[PDB]
Design a protein around this ligand. Structure first.
Ligand code: LUZ
Ligand code: 71M
Ligand code: 71M
Lengths: 1053, 240
């Protein structure tokens, strides 16, 4: 009577990953096995033709092996035919399938990636051994460099040779004022954007002074000496270096004048370091403007700098030593596109590899359309012919658009479909190639499958190009041939036709000038309606009235540069007359603010002139600070570019080669996506250029790259053979493995990918351990090997988690980090803790460990009475008092109340995963911060959803009590009146920057993140912010929203 | 006029995946907004040709006629104007919505198998290339020795003839039988490559049969949830 005795006959518990809830797989140290056996037999192929088979240890170096091989070769026949061991090198077939020559003989058998365990002996061919250290580049990249050399495509081979332009330019900037500018590349100044200080930071200074501590070392280099200055906040490093030397070298045996002489000689030989990490203060900025200082102000800390001899810094730097690689037109005055007098017609031919149930589906056809982001003609299909079985339409499809009216950035978007409408595969092609040449002939387009979120019929946002995956639907087709390669107009030609279309525009009848897209006004009310349009966000989609209204007035729209995004989307790109005019505006349109200009690199602006202007904006306004804040979005936005070689790619590559802190995250963001075939080609070639030009950092990256690979392999085994073993058993395997010499080599001496400022020295394995989570993350711990470890942190520790897709967290943390800077630099102190997170592969990454923080659950478990009845509402409050006592308590509650307000707003806005006691965290000092955000923009609204507008952080009693300093009926205090007013002032602040947050999310559609498939995903953040409404309504909306989830509290302003 | 049936976001989630022609209809900005999908938004006596006295008057005229004569490039008409037991329709919502969510996970599970199988396949293909290249080196090695070995015979012969040439032939036999193992090892992958390639196709197949059900199961669930909301916003979540 529970189930009405209704049997489920299909069901059977034996034979899902629902039981113990992943992403995989990979081959490690040898083919089909994760870690090679500790003692292994390796077949050594000699030049005398003999196979002698050595038992080597897993860990053995190639020097050690060679030395033993030629000992064991004396025992085998034809020994007299062998040279000295010194006149030979090793080679073998690797897991990437290439025959890599083994030059660095200090390398170990396990680290070679060998496929089958065998080694051939040879005399080293290709006498430039220097040149065959492209393996370095190929190891850094993840695919071998030779894999590009055998690629047919001219674009790819032209990208490789052309982009060297940029590489040479940047290396010239580096060796300009050497050694200074070489140090300036490596250790750029880590510096807040504004020198101007927020009022609340200032008031921790007593009229703008800080107490600093300059450190020095003298003899031999053991003892150190504090020199505790008290200098103006906006005095520069050179002034701080003087005053430290002044005090260092005052004496009873040195007169007033004698000091000043001894200052001037000594002063310029030193520069300022940060004690405990490789940061430096190498240029004229206010001390406050460096990040490290400003933290030391906010955290109530005394900066610990170090005086460092310039020749001990310029000792530690190397030579940049760039080298040009071993890889070092037009038919006629060909037939210009504007001559080609015809409509568009494309011939569909046949799909081959279509996988469909004949039982389920009736009929299948090819859908088609032309696009520019949005579409320049009426969509069409071909008839429902030869359905299922063989699919073969020999039709010319007929598109109502003239061939001269195709814009430079025009694209065919097609999709095989089922009838009941429902897509099977999809693929998109650019109607022009990278040499401006209109596509004519026969193409072999291999197709992509429909993703999760896209249930739509065609997918125009999807990537241009064929699928690299062969065994998929290959729909071949034919384009119309016009007895000549048809090339796109010059700008010299587009300009003239614009100057004609405008000079023509001046002479029509006014009788005719009422067609609702042409201006004669030369009104006061209109000019207010235009800047009204300008202020609205990207997703407030424009009407046909507003479009034509904008398009007519386009020349007045120069007064309001910031309108441009709206204007561009108002041009009819199917009208070359219009487009040629627009081209002339953009040529000399007033450059704009990057936050607005970044919209122009999203998928709704795919024209090259537009995107050029947008890069032009970044060349002017965007600073090396603001670039690395938005880098993620700019690396993402490359995917929407038509061709490999373009202005944005050349902008970013240079900046990366100009600044080794951008360079670092630029590598890892690309290298992250290298598993993804949509971008394997593009990002490989780009990463080849960086890795060829970036100087000695290639060797630093190779060590990071080698370390991450060791940990991928280690966890891969923990997650597969050592599942169904107790932690005790697992840890005893993890400890066993990390003590091996290859691991100790590979995992000890290198830089944190999370922040290469911090070095990572030896591994303290006693603090190294696996967490509880069934993803099997590693808690890794390293000795900070800085001279001044003790002044910053003796131990460094970060979490390596093979198993989760970090890049949602990565982005929500980014978004928080931005909201904080927006709030704070606009004078109001809420304190978010956007901890660090870095995706370095396919669901592999690194998370910063914030020390002295705890899940509320722990707070309540520790401070929870025995004889388990119920946890107390106060035991957070009691735990936090137990930490902060005196006037210290009063300021700890301020921190909780300042962080907790900001984390309420961001969370509510971003719609992130439901907050609860195991993903909220409080620190000893009393700050609250969220962790493990899951899905951001309300992505569990795919199941139902519909006007949910969720409050994820709901302030239970626990949190309320602590905000209200231990009272009862916390709801009704001033403590809470303050809190409420923070939440309102925070909410409204983000709402006036809501263009940015939309825009950032817009640029992220490129990444294959389930949570961002299409613009209406993003649109959640409009409702959440109430951008359609007026701001007082937005305020009351937010109150209403926060009041219902809490049940009473919020109704007065 | 109010019962003529007529924010931005929910209009698009009802105009999502409809045909070429489907439509519907700050006050200090404008009054009413026609959202024709070709999404083209058109503002609204009710621009110059204002003689249409109502919100229902203005929409009937362009149901018959196209919008090319009004604004040049809009050659598209307004062609598609898209159980009394209130509890039992709400029960059906949960049922279809469980069936949708249940059908989605089967679709999401397969997408991973597809994508793993893509990777595992191509990992096999690269291994094959590697095997082939590995063999080429051993085929070259069994060649390389035939030059130097049978040159040694002719240098002397008499000097430990079978004493030397046995231990040269032994090596040569180990060289070739090892090649036999590798070639056998390559084949054994290629057979599994097609077994993978077979399974791969079967995932593709089953995805494409699950998709049209998924869309129609979703589309019903929308209209079921529409008919209910013709308020009770918060009771929906228990079913849903
Ligand atoms: O015609 C093309 N063939 C390709 O293989 C290709 N691959 C990547 C990007 N575009 C491409 N375009
Ligand atoms: C003989 C050959 C051709 C192409 C690629 C490779 N690895 N080998
Ligand atoms: C839904 C839609 C249509 C046309 C352009 C854009 N950006 N979006």
């Amino acid at each position: 009577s529970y189930y009405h005795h209704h049997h489920h006959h299909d069901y059977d518990i034996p034979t899902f990953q629902g039981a113990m809830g992943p992403p995989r797989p990979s081959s490690g140290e040898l083919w089909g096995i994760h870690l090679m056996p500790p003692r292994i037999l390796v077949e050594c192929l000699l030049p005398n033709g003999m196979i002698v088979t050595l038992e080597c240890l897993r860990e053995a170096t190639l020097i050690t092996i060679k030395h033993e091989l030629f000992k064991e070769a004396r025992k085998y026949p034809l020994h007299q035919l062998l040279q000295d061991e010194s006149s030979y090198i090793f080679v073998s077939v690797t897991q990437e399938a290439e025959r890599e020559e083994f030059f660095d003989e200090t390398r170990r058998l396990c680290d070679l990636r060998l496929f089958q365990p065998f080694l051939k002996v040879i005399e080293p061919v290709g006498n430039r051994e220097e040149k065959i250290l492209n393996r370095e580049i190929g190891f850094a990249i993840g695919m071998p460099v030779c894999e590009f050399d055998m690629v047919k495509d001219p674009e790819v081979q032209d990208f490789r040779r052309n982009i060297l332009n940029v590489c040479k330019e940047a290396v010239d900037l580096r060796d300009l004022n050497s050694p200074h500018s070489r140090a300036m590349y490596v250790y750029p100044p880590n510096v807040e954007s504004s020198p101007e200080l927020p009022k609340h930071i200032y008031n921790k200074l007593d009229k703008g002074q800080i107490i600093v501590v300059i450190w020095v070392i003298v003899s031999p280099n053991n003892d150190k000496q504090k020199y505790t200055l008290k200098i103006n906040h906006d005095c520069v490093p050179e002034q701080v270096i003087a005053e430290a030397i002044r005090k260092k070298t005052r004496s009873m045996l040195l007169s007033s004048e004698q000091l000043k002489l001894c200052v001037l000689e000594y002063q310029g030989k030193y520069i300022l370091k940060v004690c405990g990490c490789d940061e430096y203060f190498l240029e004229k900025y206010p001390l406050s403007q460096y990040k490290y200082i400003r933290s030391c102000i906010m955290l109530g800390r005394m900066p610990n700098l170090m005086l460092m001899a310039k020749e001990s810094l310029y000792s530690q730097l190397p030579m940049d030593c760039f080298t040009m690689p071993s890889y070092s037109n037009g038919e006629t005055s060909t037939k210009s596109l504007w001559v080609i007098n015809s409509a568009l017609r494309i011939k569909i031919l046949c799909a081959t590899y279509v996988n469909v149930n004949i039982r389920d589906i009736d009929k299948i056809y090819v859908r088609t359309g032309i696009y520019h982001g949005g579409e320049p003609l009426c969509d069409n299909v071909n008839t429902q012919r030869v359905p299922c079985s063989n699919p073969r339409w020999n039709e010319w499809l007929n598109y109502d658009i003239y061939i001269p009216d195709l814009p430079r950035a025009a694209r065919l978007c097609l999709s095989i479909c089922s009838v009941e409408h429902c897509p099977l595969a999809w693929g998109n092609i650019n109607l022009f190639d990278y040499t401006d040449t209109l596509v004519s002939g026969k193409m072999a387009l291999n197709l992509w499958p429909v993703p999760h979120g896209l249930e739509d019929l065609l997918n125009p946002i999807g990537v241009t190009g064929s699928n690299p995956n062969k065994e998929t639907p290959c729909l071949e087709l034919e384009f119309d041939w016009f007895s000549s390669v048809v090339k796109f107009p010059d700008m010299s030609v587009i300009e003239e036709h614009a100057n004609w279309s405008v000079s023509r525009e001046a002479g029509f009848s006014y009788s005719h000038a009422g067609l609702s897209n042409r201006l004669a006004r030369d009104r006061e009310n209109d000019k207010e309606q235009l800047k009204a349009i300008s202020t609205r966000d990207p997703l407030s989609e424009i009407t046909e009235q507003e479009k034509d209204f904008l398009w007519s007035h386009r020349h007045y729209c120069v007064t309001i540069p910031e309108i441009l995004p709206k204007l561009l989307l108002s041009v009819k790109w199917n009208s070359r007359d219009e487009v040629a005019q627009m081209y002339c505006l953009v040529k000399d349109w007033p450059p704009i603010k990057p936050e607005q200009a970044m919209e122009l690199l999203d998928c709704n602006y795919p024209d090259p002139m537009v995107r050029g202007f947008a890069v032009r904006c970044l060349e002017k306004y965007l600073t090396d600070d603001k670039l690395s804040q938005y880098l993620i979005q700019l690396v993402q936005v490359l995917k929407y570019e038509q061709y490999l070689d373009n202005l944005l790619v050349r902008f970013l590559l240079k900046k990366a080669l100009t600044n080794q802190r951008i360079g670092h995250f630029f590598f890892w963001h690309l290298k992250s996506e290298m598993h993804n075939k949509t971008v394997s080609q593009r990002f490989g070639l780009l990463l080849e250029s960086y890795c060829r030009a970036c100087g000695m950092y290639l060797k630093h990256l190779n060590r990071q790259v080698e370390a991450m690979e060791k940990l991928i392999n280690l966890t891969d085994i923990l997650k597969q053979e050592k599942k169904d073993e107790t932690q005790k058993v697992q840890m005893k395997f993890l400890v066993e493995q990390m003590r091996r010499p290859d691991f100790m080599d590979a995992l000890q001496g290198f830089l944190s990918p999370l922040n290469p400022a911090h070095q990572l020295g030896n591994l303290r394995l006693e603090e190294c351990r696996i967490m509880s989570s069934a993803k099997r993350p590693l808690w890794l711990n390293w000795e900070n090997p800085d001279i001044m470890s003790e002044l910053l942190f003796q131990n460094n520790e970060i979490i390596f988690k093979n198993g989760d897709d970090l890049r949602q967290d990565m982005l929500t943390l980014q978004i928080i980090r931005i909201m904080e800077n927006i709030w704070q630099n606009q004078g109001l102190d809420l304190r978010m803790l956007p901890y660090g997170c870095l995706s370095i592969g396919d669901c592999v990454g690194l998370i910063e460990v914030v020390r002295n923080s705890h899940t509320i659950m722990q707070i309540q478990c520790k401070g929870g009475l025995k004889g388990a009845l119920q946890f107390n509402s106060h035991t957070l409050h009691q735990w936090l008092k137990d930490k902060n006592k005196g006037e210290i308590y009063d300021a700890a509650i301020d921190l909780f109340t300042r962080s907790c307000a900001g984390y309420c707003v961001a969370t509510f806005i971003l719609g992130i995963g439901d907050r609860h006691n195991s993903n909220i965290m409080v620190k000893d000092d009393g700050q609250l911060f969220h962790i493990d955000f899951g899905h951001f923009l309300d992505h569990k609204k795919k199941k139902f959803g519909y006007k949910r507008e969720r409050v994820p952080f709901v302030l239970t009693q626990d949190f309320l009590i602590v905000i209200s300093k231990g009272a009862q009926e916390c709801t009704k205090t001033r403590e809470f009146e303050r809190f409420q007013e923070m939440c309102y002032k925070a909410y409204l602040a983000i709402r006036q920057h809501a263009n940015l947050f939309i825009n950032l999310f817009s640029m992220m559609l490129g990444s294959g993140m389930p949570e961002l498939q299409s613009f209406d995903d993003i649109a959640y953040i409009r409702k959440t912010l109430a951008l359609d409404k007026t701001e007082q309504e937005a305020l009351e909306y937010f109150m209403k929203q926060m009041n219902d989830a809490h049940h009473g509290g919020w109704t007065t302003k | 006029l109010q019962d003529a049936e007529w924010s931005r976001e929910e209009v698009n989630e009802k105009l999502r995946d409809t045909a070429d022609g489907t439509f519907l209809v700050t006050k200090m900005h404008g009054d009413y907004t026609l959202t024709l999908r070709k999404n083209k938004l058109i503002k609204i006596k009710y621009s110059d040709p204002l003689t249409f006295s109502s919100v229902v008057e203005l929409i009937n005229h362009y149901r018959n006629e196209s919008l090319a004569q009004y604004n040049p490039k809009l050659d598209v008409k307004l062609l598609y104007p898209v159980e009394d037991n209130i509890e039992a329709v709400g029960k059906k919502l949960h049922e279809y919505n469980t069936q949708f969510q249940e059908k989605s996970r089967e679709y999401d599970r397969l997408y991973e198998e597809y994508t793993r199988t893509s990777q595992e396949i191509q990992m096999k293909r690269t291994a094959i290339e590697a095997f082939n290249e590995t063999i080429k080196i051993f085929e070259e090695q069994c060649q390389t020795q035939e030059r130097y070995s049978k040159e040694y015979i002719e240098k002397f012969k008499r000097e430990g003839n079978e004493k030397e040439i046995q231990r040269i032939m032994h090596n040569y036999d180990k060289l070739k039988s090892r090649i036999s193992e590798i070639i056998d090892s390559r084949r054994r992958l290629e057979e599994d490559l097609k077994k993978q390639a077979a399974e791969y196709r079967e995932i593709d197949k089953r995805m494409n049969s699950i998709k049209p059900d998924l869309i129609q199961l979703r589309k019903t669930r929308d209209q079921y949830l529409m008919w209910l909301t013709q308020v009770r916003q918060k009771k929906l979540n228990e079913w849903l």
